[PDB]
Amino acid sequence: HWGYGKHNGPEHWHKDFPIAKGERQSPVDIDTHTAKYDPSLKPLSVSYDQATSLRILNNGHAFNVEFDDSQDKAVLKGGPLDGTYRLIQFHFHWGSLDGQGSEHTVDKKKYAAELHLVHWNTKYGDFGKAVQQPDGLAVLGIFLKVGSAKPGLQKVVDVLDSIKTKGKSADFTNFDPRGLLPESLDYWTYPGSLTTPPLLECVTWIVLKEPISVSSEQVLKFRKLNFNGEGEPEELMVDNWRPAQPLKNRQIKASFK
Ligand SMILES: CCCCCCc1ccc(S(N)(=O)=O)cc1
Ligand code: NA
Ligand code: NA
Ligand SMILES: [Zn+2]
Secondary structure, eight states: OOOTTTSSSSTGGGGGGGGGGGOOSSEEETTTTTTTTTTTTTOOOEOOOOEEEEEEOOOSSSEEEEEOOOOSSEEEEEETTOEEEEEEEEEEEEEESTTOOSSSTTTTTTSEEEEEEEEEEGGSSSSSHTTTTTSSSSEEEEEESSSSSOOGGGGHHHGGGGGGGGOEEEEESSOOGGGGGOOOOOOOEEEOOOOSSSOOOEEEEEESSOEEOOOHHHHHHHTTTTTTTTTTTOBBBBOOOOOOOOOOOOOOOOEEO
């Protein structure tokens, strides 16, 4: 099956997922000079006060922090979006070294990691129906740079020892995702896709301009996770990012002047 190694990584995905060569694939390089400020874009409305985290799972590709998406608790609205998108999970992509790891790039700059908060459009009723639509998902992307520690990330870091290998999960209740945001909600937006198989073209991407800082020790602990299952040869979970894809017939819009 698919992965991020030389024999199953991004250059191979198109064989089982031909949409990998589609017209609105993600991630992309954000050329800051040619992104055009759109004064009609609204401020992002991030309403996470009632978020109910449930569990953290090593899925063999990253770790997902999962939320209760049965009801309208944590939602994303505004910005480029029409209607209401419910938070279902977040996860990260990161590198083996601080100089790589993000999926989106900014003027070709790679960040050490990238956080994806995944939301589905409530008009479609369930996540599974949302991923059959071109406006089914909204992913809020946040870059991570290495510097000072992010206090709101430490609870995530300190559970990773308990989900080292593929298929392991742990309770992860009462986690507040507001602690992962930067100060500013200024963003770029464009239409794209999931960045892993099945690579479905359902995503309104909202990528925040301002990175969050995390410490070297925090990202080092991400890199101690394993892609493999328990009892299998150890393969460190690093470099679980897809490179930038062709922009094709798309424009990236900026929320800020
Ligand atoms: C038919 C089931 C599809 C599950 C898709 C799960 C998924 C969610 C978000 C992302 S990402 N990295 O674009 O945020 C990738 C994959
Ligand atoms: Na442009
Ligand atoms: Na419920
Ligand atoms: Zn992702």
